[model samples]
Target: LDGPYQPTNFKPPNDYWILLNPTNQQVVLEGTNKTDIWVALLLVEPNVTNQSRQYTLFGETKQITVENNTNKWKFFEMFRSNVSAEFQHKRTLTSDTKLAGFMKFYNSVWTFHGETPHATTDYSSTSNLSEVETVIHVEFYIIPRSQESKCSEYINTG
Candidate 1:
């Protein structure tokens, strides 16, 4: 059961021949009694920024694409922060001054649609265009086929 098997050396009959559990872990059935398995783990360090960086604003419109490279589907949440009291109280307003994007996930998928857009005030407001640093937070949850599945054991998250 312990041998080096390269995916390039063998061709699967179909895509479903491989099974991916909820944790984005994968298992391939090469034969009746043989299976090729793989796991995915992600560890993120905690910092004060996790809360402050929850919101983000893009300077321009950009297209963001996410692909499920692993065997299972992944659910994610994205959020953009709103203007802080410090910024609003400064009395200086810019064209770019707007609420940050915010999104949450109730289930296993993103509840919001499309890339979050930045908000704008008045059409003649030039002050909001001022460049400033903003934070964005993205988190995801993976659900496996079964809690006791082998793939679940390999999913490492910290």
Candidate 2:
């Protein structure tokens, strides 16, 4: 006598019927709207950390702008940091209270070099760009030290 093997077929629950059928569009529409509503509810009062000190740099144009021949500026509470002390002291000596000291320090520390296409010795309230019609353009470049491999081909050529 040969044994009989039975085959059974099953279907997924109909809870997804509304999602599958356009006739049940209201349920999907309500769900889509509700998602944004829930997100808005949670975002109404979000928590954020309040840092004491924050610093930033700005330039008139994108290329390589130099303000008063320097780029250093103070931030909220960072003025008291040891790093800032060193920066201020160096600027006081070399730039002689000129703003160019800041730029020098920024380049030395971050970019390893600082340069200004305009004269750095002459001090004036007017910006370097004022001498010319267009805004001063500043640019920063960071090149890898090792030449073991060619520059990444995918990098932005600009």
Candidate 3:
């Protein structure tokens, strides 16, 4: 994105959908096909241990409301980057887990526990407001239900 916020449209030919709406600090959890995609909406935080995650900070919380598919596994780890410096594993959920005001941090293996306050990140900060902090990371990859099937011919190796 050129600035803190910009316009984004879903491309047809594209393999995945990544909509970064800084205006609302929300991203699209999108992909294609039978293979499942796992993501970790982590937060770059300080005053906490690196080994252990601390998702209890201002604007540090994040929310997750999945769709159509709600079948999940123990954890899915694929396609990663240092972009989060940072982050978890888990997905395939129903309904929404939102915050009253906002959300937090580092991949702590996401999993829903029924319902609770700030069940997810609202991206709000009151006690320790984070105004200067302006950086969000979003990345995900797919996992097929079965192994690659080698069949047919190589149509376009070009």
Candidate 3 global CA lDDT score: 0.22
lDDT by residue for model 2 (50-123), tens: 32222121211112111222232111101112211211211111111111111111111110011222212211
TM-score per candidate, in order?
A: 0.17, 0.15, 0.20
Q: Point out the higher-scoring one by TM-score: 2 or 3.
A: 3
Kindly provide the TM-score of model 1 when superposed on the true structure, using C-alpha atoms: 0.17
Q: Report how far residue 71 has shifted in candidate 1, in Å.
A: 28
**All candidates in order of TM-score, best leading:** 3, 1, 2
Off by over 4 Å in 3: 6-35, 49-158
In the range 25-130, model 1's lDDT, one tens digit per residue, is 1111111101111111111121212222121122222222233333222222222223221111111111111111111112111111111121111111112222
Model 1 residue 22 CA deviation in Å:
17
Number of the top candidate by TM-score?
3
Clashes of each: 13, 14, 15
